[PDB]
Design a protein around this ligand. Structure first.
Ligand code: MG
Length: 229
């Protein structure tokens, strides 16, 4: 039934089965010492502390939040989301998790896996246009109770009142990507994937999205340190 499952598993992608549907889930771990551009992910802890000690009212204030509450979130689209990526920073590590829609008609499985795990009220984002949340028809209570709470932009909107992520990476964060698959190619790659279901078509897209969510961490740190200096 589900094709290329062995090939997907080598890439760290496994299926999540739900209600006669499925989605594909990838998980990568990084050490807290990992440097992504100028900053190691361990500097997040410092900026969350400084925010909690700050009397400054700001859209990016982490006052009242712990570092684990923040979901660094980025999506790819085809117009609707087909890839949900997020990173989360814990005491020993950073976890990147990606939920891939294998084709239209699997949205219940996608939302069941994503909404089970992500606090959609605490997203850190860099999205210019409002999120194109996929449409879904379900009885399930977890999903229905969230559809109208699905935000246009993250709570921590890194683009607030304000430029491409690539340009910020190079000019501000000191991040250089090797042989990146650009976001504007994801639609065409995904369109061909729907038919052929060959993992090779999306491995580059999945790496790009992974690099996206890590850069959101580096950007949040960068912007916070500028503010709290
Ligand atoms: Mg992206």
């Amino acid at each position: 039934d589900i094709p290329f499952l062995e090939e997907w598993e080598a890439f760290g992608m496994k299926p999540f089965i739900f209600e006669d549907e499925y989605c594909l889930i990838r998980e990568v771990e990084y050490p807290l010492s990992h440097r992504h551009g100028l900053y190691s992910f361990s500097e997040l802890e410092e900026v969350i502390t400084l925010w909690n000690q700050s009397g400054l009212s700001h859209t990016l204030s982490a006052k009242g939040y712990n570092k684990n509450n923040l979901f660094f979130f980025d999506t790819e689209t085809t117009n609707t989301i087909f890839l949900l990526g997020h990173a989360r920073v814990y005491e020993d590590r950073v976890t990147v998790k990606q939920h891939l829609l294998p084709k239209p008609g699997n949205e219940v499985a996608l939302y069941q896996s994503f909404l089970s795990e992500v606090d959609i009220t605490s997203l850190v984002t860099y999205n210019g246009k409002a999120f194109d949340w996929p449409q879904v028809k379900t009885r399930h209570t977890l999903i229905r109770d969230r559809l109208p709470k699905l935000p246009e932009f993250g709570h921590f909107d890194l683009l607030h009142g304000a430029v491409s992520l690539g340009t910020v990476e190079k000019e501000e964060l000191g991040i250089r990507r090797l042989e990146d698959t650009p976001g504007y190619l994801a639609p065409m790659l995904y369109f061909h994937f729907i038919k052929a279901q060959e993992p090779d078509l999306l491995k580059g897209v999945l790496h790009h999205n992974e690099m996206d969510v890590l850069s959101l961490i580096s950007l949040y740190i960068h912007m916070s340190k500028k503010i709290l200096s």
